[PDB]
Amino acid sequence: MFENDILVAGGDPGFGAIKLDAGDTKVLFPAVICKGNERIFSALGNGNVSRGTDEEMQTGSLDVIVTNHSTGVSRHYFMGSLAESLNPNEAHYCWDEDKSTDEEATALLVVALAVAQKEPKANIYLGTGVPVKYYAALKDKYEAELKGTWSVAFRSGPFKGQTRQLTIIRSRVLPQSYGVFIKETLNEYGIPISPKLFNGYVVVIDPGFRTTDVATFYDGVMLDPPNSFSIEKGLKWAYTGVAEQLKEMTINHANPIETDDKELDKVFRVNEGMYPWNNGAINLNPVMQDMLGQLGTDISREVKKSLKPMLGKIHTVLVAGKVGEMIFEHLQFENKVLIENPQFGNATGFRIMAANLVNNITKKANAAP
Ligand SMILES: Nc1ncnc2c1ncn2[C@@H]1O[C@H](COP(=O)(O)OP(=O)(O)O)[C@@H](O)[C@H]1O
Ligand SMILES: [Mg+2]
Numbered sequence: 529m530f531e532n533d534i535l536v537a538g539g540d541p542g543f544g545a546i547k548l549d550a551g552d553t554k555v556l557f558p559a560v561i562c563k564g565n566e567r568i569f570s571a572l573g574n575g576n577v578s579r580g581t582d583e584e585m586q587t588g589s590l591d592v593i594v595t596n597h598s599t600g601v602s603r604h605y606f607m608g609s610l611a612e613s614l615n616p617n618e619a620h621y622c623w624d625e626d627k628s629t630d631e632e633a634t635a636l637l638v639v640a641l642a643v644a645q646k647e648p649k650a651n652i653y654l655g656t657g658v659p660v661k662y663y664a665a666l667k668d669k670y671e672a673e674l675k676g677t678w679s680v681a682f683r684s685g686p687f688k689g690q691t692r693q694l695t696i697i698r699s700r701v702l703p704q705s706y707g708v709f710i711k712e713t714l715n716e717y718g719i720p721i722s723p724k725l726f727n728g729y730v731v732v733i734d735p736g737f738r739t740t741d742v743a744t745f746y747d748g749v750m751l752d753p754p755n756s757f758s759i760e761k762g763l764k765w766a767y768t769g770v771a772e773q774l775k776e777m778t779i780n781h782a783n784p785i786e787t788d789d790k791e792l793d794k795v796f797r798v799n800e801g802m803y804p805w806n807n808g809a810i811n812l813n814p815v816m817q818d819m820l821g822q823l824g825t826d827i828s829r830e831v832k833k834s835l836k837p838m839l840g841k842i843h844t845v846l847v848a849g850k851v852g853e854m855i856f857e858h859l860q861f862e863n864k865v866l867i868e869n870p871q872f873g874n875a876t877g878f879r880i881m882a883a884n885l886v887n888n889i890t891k892k893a894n895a896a897p
Pocket of ligand 1: 542544737797
């Protein structure tokens, strides 16, 4: 790695989960935020058991004050998986692409970088990616916003105390699916590794949480918007279906289940589709894989609507994101690859791009900074 521990790090392909690649270490948690309170009653030992294997795997157990050090203002958050399990009435996914407003939407990534950073203060060069259709109209705003000094104070577990500071030197922003293509085509040190991916046509898919995003790479180049686009049918649309089916499985009761997506996401993350109830369990997995039969069909049709003129030419369809593991058997393409370590595909490519933009000839000193 580099001769100074400034983070070269790539991350926030986040609407379902912030995820972040910093080389030998990685951060991952669901993108749930709450403007948390003192935890005063619920701090009791009554269920306060830790199950983690590292400080890294203390991820998502996050209880913080975040400070915009560049402006001297501060806010208190429960962040990630903890917030599913403190304020389930008021904790929510942050849900807009724009981060010019919404310091909340930046705070998730600020916390993730502070978890990644091993030592109390350092500088960072950042890679990240907005969803594909926005890259024509949004990247410059992130390249202004997502910069300068931040700090995080922590109260839970191995993180506790330790009021870390970090400074983003500068950020490189890319269209979200491109990170997958990058991590598949390039070595750690930016050398290309298989011309089989460069020549002819490749299609690359993040079947993501808020959105499913698709880009066509021809001869090594991402093609322009009518060939590389974005689709509102992300996993959250399937949970909106599962919620109506769970409601119609409990409308027969005197007061029906009325879950927002967050509880279904919890139920698939934590305990494999068994929604908790009297007599122990309601099992959603039949309903869920009935929905992902729909969503995988629809991602295939929403693709073919814009790509069918090209369809015969395609070497392969790359699939990424957590939902890649959930949908991949159902997508209607003859040559099709689920990329290695599916979760991080966008983030890893953003790190590899950040390494390019933190050479001395791109942005570093000749000295250690
Ligand atoms: N730590 C985790 N444990 C289990 N499932 C996870 C975890 N992190 C993310 N997922 C789940 O994967 C889905 C999000 O997929 P993701 O690739 O992160 O979508 P996106 O890139 O578009 O934001 C959600 O259901 C989310 O809860
Ligand atoms: Mg995604």
